[PDB]
């Protein structure tokens, strides 16, 4: 069984460079081309280039040419993709994909899990958690993605809606997590939202009360 495991997410300032790894297993590493496809949030797929792990030869997309470098290390069956002089619009999920077909075209039968690369001139910051006294929590002004919100340490799951984050003009993200409950338990059942923003090691328990 084929597996493509990529490196964790990264956060970079505009102008800096990022390097993503992609370790392969379950097949002859030097026997199949490795491609790199990215996907901006909400947008479609975009081919960047491929590398022949046997030869080491490359073929970069016309728009990433002169900014991308694709290498490989056969001894560890790992491919690399370095994108330098980054811009804000380079924020995307970066995938490594194996093309398994000698004939015909490029058919990507195995993909990595992706590596989110956030490129922004903003600095990291923990969120401000404000209650929404249906009740919820407002996870405002944080950077970068993501944040994980649970209610009562995951004991409460039914009726919970955690909305996708929005990028505010300030460069910071913000989302809301609401939940619907019977009105009989409001003066009795205690409702706490647990916000966890790993990038800043910020954890907030906020008791929502009418």
């Amino acid at each position: 069984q084929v597996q493509l495991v990529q490196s964790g997410a990264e956060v970079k300032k505009p102008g800096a460079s990022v390097k993503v790894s992609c370790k392969a297993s379950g097949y002859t590493f030097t026997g199949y081309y490795m491609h790199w496809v990215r996907q901006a949030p909400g947008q479609g797929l975009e081919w960047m280039g491929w590398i022949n792990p046997n030869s080491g030869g490359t073929n970069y997309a016309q728009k990433f040419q002169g900014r991308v470098t694709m290498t490989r290390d056969t001894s560890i069956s790992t491919a690399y993709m370095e994108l330098s002089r980054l811009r804000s619009d380079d924020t995307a999920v970066y995938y490594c994909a194996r093309d398994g077909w000698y004939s015909s075209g490029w058919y990507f039968d195995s993909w990595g899990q992706g590596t989110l690369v956030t490129v922004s001139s903003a600095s990291t910051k923990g969120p401000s958690v404000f209650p929404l006294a249906a009740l919820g929590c407002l996870v405002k002004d944080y950077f970068p993605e993501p944040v994980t919100v649970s209610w009562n340490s995951g004991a409460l799951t039914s009726g919970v809606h955690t909305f996708p984050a929005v990028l505010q003009s300030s460069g910071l993200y913000s989302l809301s997590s609401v939940v619907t409950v019977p009105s009989s338990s409001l003066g009795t059942q205690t409702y706490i939202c647990n916000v966890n923003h790993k990038p800043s090691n910020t954890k907030v328990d906020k008791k929502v009360e009418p």
Binding site: G44, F130, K140
Partner: protein, 208 residues
């Protein structure tokens, strides 16, 4: 060069047949491929060589077409078959077609939330309008401050189509400064949705 997919969004119920189009501007090789991408996951290969099913792909998936027009067909839509679908040939991808579950219309449950006191102590006031569990997703939320329309000072977010009830939820946030927030009395969000006979307005006053 560009691959154009049609339609941009396709909404059908489980059990029906969905047909996705992928046209090429130039007449190009019939070495097309179709992929399936669910939210938060990588694309999965479905069709290759325009009409060959990949490994582990159910028989309901089928592809056809050559030259400049290509099609992907699914016979009976299963709830697991609703996602985004891209066509690709060599280094060129299509913008994608989203396949959503068509559901019986449901009106949104509208709620409004005044800014919390903690935020007000920080000099900012965020008012949140919640639209819970509705279908379809095309809804218009408009903020009214003292019954006057707002613009340019709000943002909204919509969840992915729920897997349990096939509904959507929308969260809109109006953000003002404490000063500008206290210069006005009635804050409202007016929801327009085809499940609603008339636009619904949820409001509150700064007191109580």
């Amino acid at each position: 060069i560009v691959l154009t997919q049609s339609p941009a969004t396709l909404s059908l119920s489980p059990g029906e047949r969905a047909t996705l189009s992928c046209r090429a501007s130039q007449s190009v090789s019939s070495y097309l491929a179709w992929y399936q991408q669910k939210p938060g996951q990588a694309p999965r290969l479905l069709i290759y060589d325009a009409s060959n099913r990949a490994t582990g792909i159910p028989a309901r998936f089928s592809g056809s077409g050559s030259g400049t027009d290509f099609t992907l067909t699914i016979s009976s839509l299963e709830p697991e078959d609703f996602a985004v679908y891209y066509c690709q040939q060599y280094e060129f991808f299509g913008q994608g077609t989203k396949l959503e579950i068509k559901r019986t219309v449901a009106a949104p449950s509208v709620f409004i939330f005044p800014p919390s006191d903690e935020q007000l102590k920080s000099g900012t006031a965020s008012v949140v309008c919640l639209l819970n569990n509705f279908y379809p997703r095309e809804a218009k939320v408009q903020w009214k401050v003292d019954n006057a329309l707002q613009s340019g000072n709000s943002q909204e977010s919509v969840t992915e189509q729920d897997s349990k009830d096939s509904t959507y939820s929308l969260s809109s946030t109006l953000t003002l400064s404490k000063a500008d927030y206290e210069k006005h009395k009635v804050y409202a969000c007016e929801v327009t949705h085809q499940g609603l006979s008339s636009p619904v307005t949820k409001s509150f006053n700064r007191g109580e």
